């Protein structure tokens, strides 16, 4: 799993297709110099600087985003707590009448979204629409062995590599 | 002048083959090779015997990240702990960070260690807006882009009911 | 006449260092090396690979397109998009048959088949007719013209008998030449 | 490419001059943006266009082979019709005694040839010797999944 | 497609629609595509009920009254008399 369309586009929108990696050192090749990108890549250094920039356009050119919808209007919650644990977005919301002596009708809901592995929680935002529709949206990085994948500090370069699922 | 720089310092002087980034294993690169449709092979390589060393998750966070030094943000030294699993939970405006190690049978053998570090958030934060990050160099760092309100933390009426929310 | 060290032809195409015709393994697993039991399976995918070699419709994916348009005829096949093309030469008639299908979508199970018939110029050997398919989708059928010679075709006596099948004379159907 | 497989023919076209990678360099063209070093381990798409580099491959033999034999002399056919269908060369000979009333002694033969898949039928020629021996010969292009292999427009480069 | 003729035949409870497009050129009347769509009928649909419709914009609509699978194999009955002839459901 690699978004290869997004890792190959980032070198291919100019006159040549490898010159973007070539341009931050000059062209002196027997000093270990990437030629091929498919067949020869090397470690991404990629440091008015901006090669690792406008690479994602104004967000190769893609603003991947996980997004989910929740119709809550009928529920009309007094409070919605949304917790992220072990790569699962858990949305707990409570509705109850405030009656001291005897409060009846106390309804709550807890919805567990299975995140696509890779999504860092700092990208996950919740927005409640005027119509009463909860929208949980997150920028996608851009399912490994170690279990703990979420990283990315608003920094999408080299942190992915996961596909749609 | 100030030239003669040629920043070819990122070739990985990690000894075992020209890579060894995070766990010098093959199954590591087997995840970053191509598409997953069974009659599509296994990348079948290992370090030297391969197409070039590509740094294409936490491999760019080996060099530049380190600790990040750090917008809310908190730093946590994890390298010495060296956890097999890290669980980060945000509940009732409290970030709870739980690390775990695990079993290898030897002279030491059956020794477990687990740490729980609790951070009290500023009362603005969407509890889905908090995350951690693990480097190979080993310093966990937790940032949070806080929405705008939520006094008790449990009140998200914004985007439309901004009157009573902010 | 200068500015002659360009680049490109490198197939941007969005997927890996190619997407010449579909991003499949068994596509490139055919042309990698030598066919033994475990003489590897190649194991690239692109971004992770040896070169971006174009070594059979991938060479016709760029330079061909139409074959540009010897007996030679062009056939627009792109809209058809056939999975199989059978070209048959029988009794001096080149018959081009194509078949589609292989997916269950909104249309689904429509089975479409087209039969385009070409009448050969007299003298063309029935073994001498070919077809070629590009990814851009234009089929082109040529045949080397003999000596530009039978009437009914089906008279292959030429390698000894030059008398009745040979040079140019007009008399009472004894021997044709350039038509 | 003969049932199961030609790299000796793709790795000769670069090796008969002073250096062994330089033949890709001279058919082409700044040399660091994206250039060919190795050809085995690193090759790039073949563009390769006196255009002597595409013409050196054939060694001026084609100017710019599969072969089979058939002893037909005993048969003595009035007509031999050779038909290539679905990547199988089928040779049908017919013999008859022109008789209106009674045309007995009518013999026919049908020989089906396997073919190495890749052989384009435009390359397939039939020749009948004076001694009465049919020879069906074809230039080899230089088996895949798509079923329809035959292409070649008398252009051997990258097909086979 | 733009067919000169669309011939629709119903055989063994399968509607087979064969369209043909051909040029009218005696020497060489090339450029002639054909298509054969085979519809699996829901068993019980009698072929008197099956109507063919060709729209001005070129969309063929094959419509049929449902009777309201069987062992005997010959299921098509109805005479435009649908009482007690069915029993098959939607599938």
Curated annotation (Swiss-Prot), chain C:
Matches recorded under CDD domains: ACD_HspB1_like
Phosphoserine: residues carrying this PTM: 14, 25, 63, 67-68, 74, 150, 173
Q: In which tissues is it expressed?
A: Detected in all tissues tested: skeletal muscle, heart, aorta, large intestine, small intestine, stomach, esophagus, bladder, adrenal gland, thyroid, pancreas, testis, adipose tissue, kidney, liver, spleen, cerebral cortex, blood serum and cerebrospinal fluid. Highest levels are found in the heart and in tissues composed of striated and smooth muscle.
**Assembly behavior:** Homooligomer. Homodimer; becomes monomeric upon activation. Heterooligomer; with HSPB6. Associates with alpha- and beta-tubulin. Interacts with TGFB1I1. Interacts with CRYAB. Interacts with HSPB8. Interacts with HSPBAP1.
Pfam families, per the entry: HSP20
For the region Interaction with TGFB1I1, give the residue spans. Answer: 56-179
Q: Which disease is it linked to?
A: Charcot-Marie-Tooth disease, axonal, type 2F: A dominant axonal form of Charcot-Marie-Tooth disease, a disorder of the peripheral nervous system, characterized by progressive weakness and atrophy, initially of the peroneal muscles and later of the distal muscles of the arms. Charcot-Marie-Tooth disease is classified in two main groups on the basis of electrophysiologic properties and histopathology: primary peripheral demyelinating neuropathies (designated CMT1 when they are dominantly inherited) and primary peripheral axonal neuropathies (CMT2). Neuronopathy, distal hereditary motor, autosomal dominant 3: A form of distal hereditary motor neuronopathy, a heterogeneous group of neuromuscular disorders caused by selective degeneration of motor neurons in the anterior horn of the spinal cord, without sensory deficit in the posterior horn. The overall clinical picture consists of a classical distal muscular atrophy syndrome in the legs without clinical sensory loss. The disease starts with weakness and wasting of distal muscles of the anterior tibial and peroneal compartments of the legs.
Tell me where in this chain the PTM Omega-N-methylarginine is found.
Answer: 11
Question: What mutagenesis or variant effect is reported for residue 112 to L?
Answer: In CMT2F and HMND3
Q: Which PANTHER family does this chain map to?
A: HEAT SHOCK PROTEIN BETA-1, HEAT SHOCK PROTEIN HSP-12.2-RELATED
Known role: Small heat shock protein which functions as a molecular chaperone probably maintaining denatured proteins in a folding-competent state. Plays a role in stress resistance and actin organization. Through its molecular chaperone activity may regulate numerous biological processes including the phosphorylation and the axonal transport of neurofilament proteins.
Specify the sHSP domain's residue ranges.
61-158
Q: Which residues carry this modification: N6-acetyllysine?
A: 99
- Reply yes or no: does the keyword Acetylation apply: yes
Give the consequence of mutating residue 40 to K. Answer: In HMND3; increased aggregation; increased homooligomerization; changed function in chaperone-mediated protein folding
| Name of the protein this chain belongs to | Heat shock protein beta-1
- What happens upon changing residue 154 to I? In HMND3; uncertain significance
Q: What is the effect of changing residue 104 to R?
A: In HMND3; uncertain significance; no effect on dimerization; no effect on cytoplasmic location; no effect on dimerization
Keyword rRNA processing included in the entry's annotation: no
From Swiss-Prot, chain D:
Positions of the UniProt region annotated as Interaction with TGFB1I1: 50-160
Looking at the UniProt record for this protein, which Gene Ontology cellular component terms does it annotate, in alphabetical order? Answer: axon cytoplasm; cornified envelope; cytoplasm; cytoskeleton; cytosol; extracellular exosome; extracellular space; focal adhesion
User: Can you name this protein?
Assistant: Heat shock protein beta-1
Q: Where in the cell is it found?
A: Cytoplasm; Nucleus; Cytoplasm, Cytoskeleton, Spindle
Substitution effect: residue 98 to W: In HMND3; decreased homodimerization; increased client proteins binding; increased function in chaperone-mediated protein folding; alters CDK5-mediated phosphorylation of neurofilament proteins and indirectly impairs their anterograde axonal transport
Annotated organism of origin: Homo sapiens (Human)
What disease is linked with this protein in Swiss-Prot or TrEMBL?
Answer: Charcot-Marie-Tooth disease, axonal, type 2F: A dominant axonal form of Charcot-Marie-Tooth disease, a disorder of the peripheral nervous system, characterized by progressive weakness and atrophy, initially of the peroneal muscles and later of the distal muscles of the arms. Charcot-Marie-Tooth disease is classified in two main groups on the basis of electrophysiologic properties and histopathology: primary peripheral demyelinating neuropathies (designated CMT1 when they are dominantly inherited) and primary peripheral axonal neuropathies (CMT2).
Q: How does it assemble?
A: Homooligomer. Homodimer; becomes monomeric upon activation. Heterooligomer; with HSPB6. Associates with alpha- and beta-tubulin. Interacts with TGFB1I1. Interacts with CRYAB. Interacts with HSPB8. Interacts with HSPBAP1.
* Primary role: Small heat shock protein which functions as a molecular chaperone probably maintaining denatured proteins in a folding-competent state. Plays a role in stress resistance and actin organization. Through its molecular chaperone activity may regulate numerous biological processes including the phosphorylation and the axonal transport of neurofilament proteins.
What mutagenesis or variant effect is reported for residue 106 to F?
In CMT2F and HMND3; decreased homodimerization; increased client proteins binding; increased function in chaperone-mediated protein folding; alters CDK5-mediated phosphorylation of neurofilament proteins; alters CDK5-mediated phosphorylation of neurofilament proteins and indirectly impairs their anterograde axonal transport
Where in the sequence is Omega-N-methylarginine found?
11
Post-translational modification (record) = Phosphorylated upon exposure to protein kinase C activators and heat shock. Phosphorylation by MAPKAPK2 and MAPKAPK3 in response to stress dissociates HSPB1 from large small heat-shock protein (sHsps) oligomers and impairs its chaperone activity and ability to protect against oxidative stress effectively. Phosphorylation by MAPKAPK5 in response to PKA stimulation induces F-actin rearrangement.
Q: What is the effect of changing residue 62 to D?
A: Mimicks phosphorylation state, leading to dreased ability to act as molecular chaperones
UniProt domain sHSP: residue ranges: 56-152
Gene3D superfamilies attached to this UniProt entry = 2.60.40.790
Query: Belongs to which family?
Result: Belongs to the small heat shock protein (HSP20) family.
